[PDB]
């Protein structure tokens, strides 16, 4: 069957620049089926580009597919606001199949994160359950990494995490990374840490309690 | 020239739906149309094609579980979905190929969710602190979606995030809600986060402090 | 253990409709399923065959306009019929099949109508006589089935005659319903047929003499 | 594809006698796929063999299957009254098909039948169309021929018949025909005659009535 890569994950500049997607097949490929879509968060895709190279009526002027064979190029002239969403591609053979996604990003100055770490409530201490939340306020880039650390042992696969869309004043990203344990298990250590590890820290910050300290 | 879809709800695994695609604009029995899902964050995923002249097509992650129908006068395409599983919950669209010329029509498309949850309640922990600091409001163990989180009733609203939901290990979902002040304005401010969760018929304002 | 069909009305030439089929002793989705008409006053004919394993097959008079299909979760199958023509007008049932030990199962069916007719009301015209003596009523001219012709208002019935209605050429129904009496009670007994046609809310009753 | 014949198409028996139901296959034919089905006026049809000379249960000694190759037969070793319905049987491929269908009747004396013609109604001649009426009451066999006599014109093409279900008392059937004229080529003519012939009568017998006479 026919498989579509899209590079690369996430595609990172700013208004005004020139935008470069790659689509990927896995075997030659004709060129009359392979049309671009535009998807805003929260609606339907647009038809941008069919065939390899043909605007759809109403795409303007700043939207051209290209290529053939195995690599096709969607590119963006001069990038505006509205420009920024997923882009995916398409190529049908005996039935569509579509890529995995590209995603569009506003690159900013590099601003460290906003680093907080909280205890369980004393309510859900008495459900049997303890959630330790770790906040990472407006960071850029999104790329960063969470640390649990408790009582100087890695904590590994009990903890999730979410993140924002980015923020549409300061274009910077949030995030959430929750620690789940036993009330039991709780109560058998003292010092939860949370170590996080950005491209605007200098060190990795940790901030830190300890267990029952007011 | 619109394609408007029905039918999406909460299905026990196990158990069937029937998606509706209403249309106007193109008429459905002439052309090409597509059923395609998105799980939530995930991508495009493409699931049945039918012909002009009936001929059908289907991915293989559904075969045999879903059946794709229309019906001329009513202008309406069906997706007939059986055995449903836990993976086929998405947001469900309906379009209009045009093969070479590409999907040129779309619909915003139904939501469904497929969990043999339950409804519970979302229980709301605070987030309480002890330059800036930050506080906020944990919304856990409710569904299926959503909840709407407001602070201080609507009035404040700079600095606050709202993070999307994860589904935690027992089906179940969680999100944060934060906000970051002046680490002053702790003893003067009074901080109530609102939380609503209309399928549970729960509603709640704790104060955090 | 039934088989109950629902869904049959009148449909326009051109039109579609779509036949339920709500199962109880049997679960459609792991038996072969069928469906087979009838059209008035002739004999059975196949219709949709449906596997357990989801392969469909139909008669070559309907394929490209019918659509079979089932709900497990329900546990009902259906048949949507798309370009319904004027010979389509018949009874259709829904059955499983064992293909080796045949069909053990049927339901009572439900009745399609397709013409390009409307739902007038009937004309009642009387038949007079001049050893038993013959009179009669006319019941001519209406869409759809059925008329209720009865004598007397149920009094008389030794005797009575209502005949199948005959679909002329204008597309519309006519039937006669007579009685034979003795030729001498012609001037000692009055005769008065009583018509009612539902569907149009007409209500005759028309003296014979 | 496989094409049934039944024969005949109508059989006519008294109850107590042996009834036996032919089926025709158009070609060389499993025994192992062929049914038999009773309906009843107004009701669904009821398995009664299946394969090829197996009683579906709640089905009677009296009924029994046979045959094999291109023809079977159907067997009903002593009729009873509920016995008296039509009779499909079944073959299958890739997909079922049926037969045409037989008609198992009662067979009663020769009764003859008693014939009447109506005139259009006055009331009718105000709408501009002409149904001219000819009744045939209580008669055995279901055999019979209506003529129409136009001035001694034989009419062709502008009538309608249709017969009533065998009496449940007497065992005897009844047919209406109707002849639709316009009140313009009603007009044209005078004598109306309504000619029947049946196996009760010596000779046809003629009943007809002259236009606008009292």
């Known amino acids: 069957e026919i498989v579509l890569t899209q590079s690369p994950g996430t595609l990172s500049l700013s208004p005004g620049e020139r935008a470069t997607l790659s689509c990927r097949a896995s075997?030659?490929?004709?060129?009359?089926?392979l049309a671009w879509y535009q998807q805003k968060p929260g609606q339907a895709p647009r038809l941008l580009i069919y065939?390899?190279?043909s605007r759809a009526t109403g795409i303007p002027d700043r939207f051209s597919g290209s290529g053939s064979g195995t690599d096709f190029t969607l590119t963006i002239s001069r990038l505006e606001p509205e420009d920024f969403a997923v882009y995916y591609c398409?190529?049908?053979?005996?039935?569509?199949?579509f890529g995995q996604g590209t995603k569009l990003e506003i690159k900013r100055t590099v601003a460290a994160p906003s680093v907080f770490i909280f205890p369980p409530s004393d309510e859900q201490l008495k459900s049997g359950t303890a959630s330790v939340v770790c906040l990472l306020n407006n960071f850029y880039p999104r790329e960063a990494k969470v640390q649990w650390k408790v009582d100087n042992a890695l904590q590994s696969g009990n903890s999730q995490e979410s993140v924002t869309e980015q923020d549409s004043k300061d274009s910077t990203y949030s995030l959430s990374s929750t620690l789940t344990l036993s009330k039991a298990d709780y109560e058998k250590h003292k010092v939860y840490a949370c170590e996080v590890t950005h491209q605007g820290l200098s060190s990795p910050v940790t901030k830190s309690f300890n267990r029952g300290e007011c | 020239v619109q394609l408007v879809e029905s039918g999406g709800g909460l299905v026990q695994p196990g158990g069937s739906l029937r998606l509706s695609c209403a249309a106007s604009?193109?008429?459905?029995?002439?052309?090409?149309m597509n059923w395609v899902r998105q799980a939530p964050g995930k991508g495009l995923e493409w699931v049945s094609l039918?012909?002009?002249?009936?001929?059908?097509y289907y991915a293989d992650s559904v075969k045999g579980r879903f059946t794709i129908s229309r019906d001329n006068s009513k202008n309406t395409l069906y997706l007939q979905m059986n055995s449903l599983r836990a993976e086929d919950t998405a947001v469900y669209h309906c379009?209009?190929?045009?093969?070479?010329?590409?999907?040129?029509?779309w619909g915003q498309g139904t939501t469904v969710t497929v969990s043999s949850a339950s409804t519970k309640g979302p229980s709301v922990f605070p987030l309480a602190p002890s330059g800036t600091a930050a506080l906020g409001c944990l919304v856990k163990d409710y569904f299926p979606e959503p909840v709407t989180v407001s602070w201080n009733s609507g009035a404040l609203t700079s600095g606050v995030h709202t993070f999307p939901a994860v589904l935690q290990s027992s089906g179940l979902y969680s999100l944060s809600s934060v906000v970051t002040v002046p680490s002053s304005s702790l003893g003067t401010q009074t901080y109530i986060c609102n939380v609503n969760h209309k399928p549970s018929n729960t509603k709640v304002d704790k104060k955090v402090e | 253990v039934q088989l109950v069909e629902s869904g049959g009305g009148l449909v326009q030439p051109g039109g579609s409709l779509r036949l339920s089929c709500?199962?109880?002793?049997?679960?459609?989705?792991?038996?072969?399923?069928?469906?087979v008409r009838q059209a008035p006053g002739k004999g059975l004919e196949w219709?949709?065959?449906?596997?357990?394993?989801?392969?469909?097959?139909?008669?070559d008079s309907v394929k490209g306009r019918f659509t079979i299909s089932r709900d497990n979760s329900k546990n009902t199958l259906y048949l949507q019929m798309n370009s319904l023509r004027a010979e389509d007008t018949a009874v259709?049932?829904?059955?499983?099949?064992?293909?080796?030990?045949?069909?053990?199962?049927?339901?009572?069916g439900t009745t399609v109508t397709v013409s390009s007719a409307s739902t007038k009301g009937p004309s009642v015209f009387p038949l007079a006589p001049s050893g038993t003596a013959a009179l009669g009523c006319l019941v001519k001219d209406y869409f759809p089935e059925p008329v209720t012709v009865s004598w007397n208002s149920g009094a008389l019935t030794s005797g009575v005659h209502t005949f199948p209605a005959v679909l002329q050429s204008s597309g519309l129904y006519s039937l006669s319903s007579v009685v034979t009496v003795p030729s001498s009670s012609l001037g000692t007994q009055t005769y008065i047929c009583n018509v009612n046609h539902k569907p149009s809310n007409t209500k005759v009753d028309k003296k014979v003499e | 594809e496989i094409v049934l014949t039944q024969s005949p198409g109508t059989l006519s028996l008294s109850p107590g006698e042996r009834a036996t139901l032919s089926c025709?296959?158009?070609?060389?034919?499993?025994?192992?796929?062929?049914?038999?089905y009773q309906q009843k006026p107004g009701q669904a049809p009821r398995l009664?063999?299946?394969?090829?000379?197996?009683?579906?249960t709640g089905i009677p000694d009296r009924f029994s299957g046979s045959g094999s190759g291109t023809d079977f037969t159907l067997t009903i070793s002593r009729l009873e009254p509920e016995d008296f319905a039509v009779?499909?049987?079944?073959?299958?491929?890739?997909?079922?098909?049926?037969?045409?269908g037989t008609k198992l009747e009662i067979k009663r004396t020769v009764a003859a039948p008693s014939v009447f013609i109506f005139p259009p109604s006055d009331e009718q001649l105000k709408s501009g169309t002409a149904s001219v009426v000819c009744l045939l009451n209580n008669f055995y066999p279901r055999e019979a021929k209506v003529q129409w006599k136009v001035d001694n014109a034989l009419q062709s093409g502008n009538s309608q018949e249709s017969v009533t279900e065998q009496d449940s008392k007497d065992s005897t059937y009844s047919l209406s025909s109707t002849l639709t004229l316009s009140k313009a080529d009603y007009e044209k003519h005078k004598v109306y005659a309504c000619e029947v012939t049946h196996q009760g009568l010596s000779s046809p017998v003629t009943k007809s009535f002259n236009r606008g006479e009292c």
């Open positions: 039918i012909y002009s002249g009936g001929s059908t």
């Open positions: 075997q030659s490929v004709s060129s009359s089926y």
């Open positions: 604009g193109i008429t459905v029995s002439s052309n090409y």
């Open positions: 065939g390899a190279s």
């Open positions: 379009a209009r190929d045009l093969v070479v010329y590409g999907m040129d029509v």
């Open positions: 398409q190529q049908y053979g005996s039935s569509p199949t």
